[PDB]
Scaffold this active site. Structure first.
Site, PDB file in Angstrom:
ATOM      1  NE  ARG A 121      -3.711   2.093   2.639  1.00 42.80           N
ATOM      2  CZ  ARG A 121      -3.532   2.680   3.782  1.00 42.80           C
ATOM      3  NH1 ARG A 121      -2.989   2.454   4.926  1.00 42.80           N
ATOM      4  NH2 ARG A 121      -4.369   4.066   3.742  1.00 42.80           N
ATOM      5  CG  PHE A 148      -0.726   8.904   3.822  1.00 40.24           C
ATOM      6  CD1 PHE A 148      -0.333   9.282   4.931  1.00 40.24           C
ATOM      7  CD2 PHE A 148      -1.655   7.803   3.606  1.00 40.24           C
ATOM      8  CE1 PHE A 148      -0.734   8.776   6.080  1.00 40.24           C
ATOM      9  CE2 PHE A 148      -1.943   7.288   4.881  1.00 40.24           C
ATOM     10  CZ  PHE A 148      -1.416   7.525   5.966  1.00 40.24           C
ATOM     11  CD  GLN A 191      -0.030  -0.262   5.439  1.00 37.61           C
ATOM     12  OE1 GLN A 191      -0.487   0.723   5.037  1.00 37.61           O
ATOM     13  NE2 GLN A 191      -0.471  -1.209   6.219  1.00 37.61           N
ATOM     14  CG  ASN A 211      -2.337   0.628  14.559  1.00 38.77           C
ATOM     15  OD1 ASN A 211      -3.375   1.180  14.002  1.00 38.77           O
ATOM     16  ND2 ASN A 211      -1.507   1.389  15.214  1.00 38.77           N
ATOM     17  CG  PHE A 227       3.474   3.799   8.146  1.00 43.92           C
ATOM     18  CD1 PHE A 227       3.256   3.204   9.436  1.00 43.92           C
ATOM     19  CD2 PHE A 227       3.455   5.131   8.187  1.00 43.92           C
ATOM     20  CE1 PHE A 227       2.772   4.166  10.360  1.00 43.92           C
ATOM     21  CE2 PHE A 227       3.166   6.074   9.186  1.00 43.92           C
ATOM     22  CZ  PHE A 227       2.798   5.415  10.492  1.00 43.92           C
ATOM     23  CG  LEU A 282      -0.917   8.656  11.138  1.00 47.03           C
ATOM     24  CD1 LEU A 282       0.039   7.761  10.190  1.00 47.03           C
ATOM     25  CD2 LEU A 282      -2.275   8.264  11.080  1.00 47.03           C
ATOM     26  CG  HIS A 305      -0.004   4.542  13.321  1.00 43.65           C
ATOM     27  ND1 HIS A 305      -0.236   3.187  12.562  1.00 43.65           N
ATOM     28  CD2 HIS A 305      -1.446   5.271  13.221  1.00 43.65           C
ATOM     29  CE1 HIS A 305      -1.600   3.222  12.138  1.00 43.65           C
ATOM     30  NE2 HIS A 305      -2.154   4.555  12.439  1.00 43.65           N
TER      31      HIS A 305
HETATM   32  N1  I44 Z   1      -2.369  11.958  -0.706  1.00 45.59           N
HETATM   33  C1  I44 Z   1      -2.720  12.039   0.830  1.00 45.59           C
HETATM   34  C2  I44 Z   1      -3.476  10.662   1.308  1.00 45.59           C
HETATM   35  O1  I44 Z   1      -3.694  11.046   2.637  1.00 45.59           O
HETATM   36  C3  I44 Z   1      -4.764  10.187   2.961  1.00 45.59           C
HETATM   37  C4  I44 Z   1      -4.717  10.000   4.305  1.00 45.59           C
HETATM   38  N2  I44 Z   1      -5.181   8.485   4.968  1.00 45.59           N
HETATM   39  C5  I44 Z   1      -5.141   8.335   6.340  1.00 45.59           C
HETATM   40  O2  I44 Z   1      -4.743   9.188   7.184  1.00 45.59           O
HETATM   41  C6  I44 Z   1      -5.842   6.768   6.623  1.00 45.59           C
HETATM   42  C7  I44 Z   1      -7.139   6.952   6.695  1.00 45.59           C
HETATM   43  C8  I44 Z   1      -7.962   5.540   7.364  1.00 45.59           C
HETATM   44  N3  I44 Z   1      -7.750   4.493   6.450  1.00 45.59           N
HETATM   45  C9  I44 Z   1      -7.200   3.338   6.851  1.00 45.59           C
HETATM   46  O3  I44 Z   1      -6.823   3.018   8.052  1.00 45.59           O
HETATM   47  C10 I44 Z   1      -6.687   2.427   5.841  1.00 45.59           C
HETATM   48  C11 I44 Z   1      -7.117   1.063   6.017  1.00 45.59           C
HETATM   49  C12 I44 Z   1      -6.449   0.307   4.913  1.00 45.59           C
HETATM   50  O4  I44 Z   1      -5.723   0.500   3.987  1.00 45.59           O
HETATM   51  N4  I44 Z   1      -6.886  -1.247   5.175  1.00 45.59           N
HETATM   52  C13 I44 Z   1      -6.587  -2.310   4.132  1.00 45.59           C
HETATM   53  C14 I44 Z   1      -5.928  -3.391   5.050  1.00 45.59           C
HETATM   54  C15 I44 Z   1      -6.808  -3.947   5.780  1.00 45.59           C
HETATM   55  C16 I44 Z   1      -7.477  -2.949   6.845  1.00 45.59           C
HETATM   56  C17 I44 Z   1      -8.531  -3.500   7.935  1.00 45.59           C
HETATM   57  C18 I44 Z   1      -8.188  -4.854   7.983  1.00 45.59           C
HETATM   58  C19 I44 Z   1      -8.453  -6.072   7.840  1.00 45.59           C
HETATM   59  C20 I44 Z   1      -8.474  -7.251   8.253  1.00 45.59           C
HETATM   60  C21 I44 Z   1      -7.477  -7.387   9.107  1.00 45.59           C
HETATM   61  C22 I44 Z   1      -6.778  -6.170   9.848  1.00 45.59           C
HETATM   62  C23 I44 Z   1      -7.396  -4.946   9.362  1.00 45.59           C
HETATM   63  C24 I44 Z   1      -7.953  -1.787   6.238  1.00 45.59           C
HETATM   64  C25 I44 Z   1      -6.385  -2.112   7.931  1.00 45.59           C
HETATM   65  O5  I44 Z   1      -6.608  -1.455   8.395  1.00 45.59           O
HETATM   66  N5  I44 Z   1      -5.021  -2.788   7.724  1.00 45.59           N
HETATM   67  C26 I44 Z   1      -4.016  -2.042   8.702  1.00 45.59           C
HETATM   68  C27 I44 Z   1      -2.634  -2.714   8.661  1.00 45.59           C
HETATM   69  C28 I44 Z   1      -2.545  -4.003   9.822  1.00 45.59           C
HETATM   70  C29 I44 Z   1      -1.507  -3.632  10.688  1.00 45.59           C
HETATM   71  C30 I44 Z   1      -1.213  -4.583  11.508  1.00 45.59           C
HETATM   72  C31 I44 Z   1      -1.849  -5.725  11.824  1.00 45.59           C
HETATM   73  C32 I44 Z   1      -1.550  -6.747  12.831  1.00 45.59           C
HETATM   74  O6  I44 Z   1      -0.475  -7.044  13.100  1.00 45.59           O
HETATM   75  C33 I44 Z   1      -2.621  -7.674  13.628  1.00 45.59           C
HETATM   76  C34 I44 Z   1      -4.050  -6.834  13.754  1.00 45.59           C
HETATM   77  C35 I44 Z   1      -4.907  -7.279  14.313  1.00 45.59           C
HETATM   78  C36 I44 Z   1      -4.790  -8.583  15.152  1.00 45.59           C
HETATM   79  C37 I44 Z   1      -3.672  -9.111  15.220  1.00 45.59           C
HETATM   80  C38 I44 Z   1      -2.453  -8.615  14.248  1.00 45.59           C
HETATM   81  C39 I44 Z   1      -3.204  -6.115  10.922  1.00 45.59           C
HETATM   82  C40 I44 Z   1      -3.274  -4.883   9.903  1.00 45.59           C
HETATM   83  C41 I44 Z   1      -3.881  -0.907   8.080  1.00 45.59           C
HETATM   84  O7  I44 Z   1      -3.482  -0.689   6.759  1.00 45.59           O
HETATM   85  N6  I44 Z   1      -3.913   0.440   8.703  1.00 45.59           N
HETATM   86  C42 I44 Z   1      -3.890   1.862   8.298  1.00 45.59           C
HETATM   87  C43 I44 Z   1      -2.467   2.525   8.275  1.00 45.59           C
HETATM   88  C44 I44 Z   1      -1.394   1.899   8.123  1.00 45.59           C
HETATM   89  C45 I44 Z   1      -0.375   2.452   8.051  1.00 45.59           C
HETATM   90  C46 I44 Z   1      -0.263   3.693   8.372  1.00 45.59           C
HETATM   91  C47 I44 Z   1      -1.233   4.579   8.813  1.00 45.59           C
HETATM   92  C48 I44 Z   1      -2.350   3.788   8.560  1.00 45.59           C
HETATM   93  C49 I44 Z   1      -3.909   4.565   8.817  1.00 45.59           C
HETATM   94  C50 I44 Z   1      -4.385   5.348   7.728  1.00 45.59           C
HETATM   95  O8  I44 Z   1      -4.064   4.610   6.613  1.00 45.59           O
HETATM   96  N7  I44 Z   1      -5.172   6.191   7.725  1.00 45.59           N
END
Ligand code: I44
Length: 163
Positions: A54, A59, A62, A101, A112, A121, A125
């Protein structure tokens, strides 16, 4: 001294170069050790061969989902997940290395690298390192991302380890 680790990254089988990361083991020893050990593979699993799945321009980039390669998986060296160690270090700008997370206390292996100051964040995070060389490689990764995060090319960590 804080450990230094590396990620060597390809795009469509073409080398982009090496990212050098300092891990802040002084501030977040447990989170730093997880990342370090996943780079070396010492527990029998880790980042070698997995992808940046991703990548969102202006941003972050990841990676680290080496179970599912899609953002739903990964695991830590301590078990399926571990709690947020602290939120001491902040998302200060490009080059910050931080844990992905799925909400509170769900750190596994996904991580990331920021390409902008991602201050919203902070407190959500766990920041645990920073790019010290190869930010240009991170910018190349970023250039193959999209607003949805889907990558234009296959971005692969072909090797990684401790320096
Ligand atoms: N041009 C400018 C653009 O500006 C736009 C700004 N956008 C921003 O701020 C955005 C706005 C808000 N959207 C988001 O949260 C995007 C979410 C997103 O993609 N999925 C796709 C992948 C799956 C999902 C949901 C899901 C489904 C199944 C299982 C777990 C989760 C959702 C997810 O959530 N998976 C984590 C990654 C992870 C990490 C660790 C584990 C883990 O060990 C574990 C978990 C539970 C139990 C045991 C172990 C599991 C999954 C994800 O990806 N977290 C999001 C993320 C990641 C990295 C950094 C920040 C952010 C926040 C963000 O992205 N915030």
């Amino acid at each position: 001294a804080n450990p230094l680790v590396y990620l060597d990254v390809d795009a469509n089988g073409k080398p982009l170069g090496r990212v050098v990361l300092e891990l802040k083991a002084d501030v977040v020893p447990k989170t730093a050790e997880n990342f370090r050990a996943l780079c070396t593979g010492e527990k029998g699993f880790g980042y070698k061969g997995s992808t940046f799945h991703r990548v969102i321009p202006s941003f972050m980039c990841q990676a680290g989902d080496f179970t599912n390669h899609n953002g739903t998986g990964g695991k830590s060296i301590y078990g399926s997940r571990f709690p947020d160690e602290n939120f001491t270090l902040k998302h200060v700008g490009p080059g910050v290395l931080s844990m992905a997370n799925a909400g509170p206390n769900t750190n596994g292996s996904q991580f990331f690298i920021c390409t902008i100051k991602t201050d919203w964040l902070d407190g959500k995070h766990v920041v645990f390192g920073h790019v010290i060389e190869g930010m240009d490689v991170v910018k190349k990764i970023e250039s193959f991302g999209s607003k949805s995060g889907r990558t234009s090319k296959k971005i692969v960590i072909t090797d990684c380890g401790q320096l």
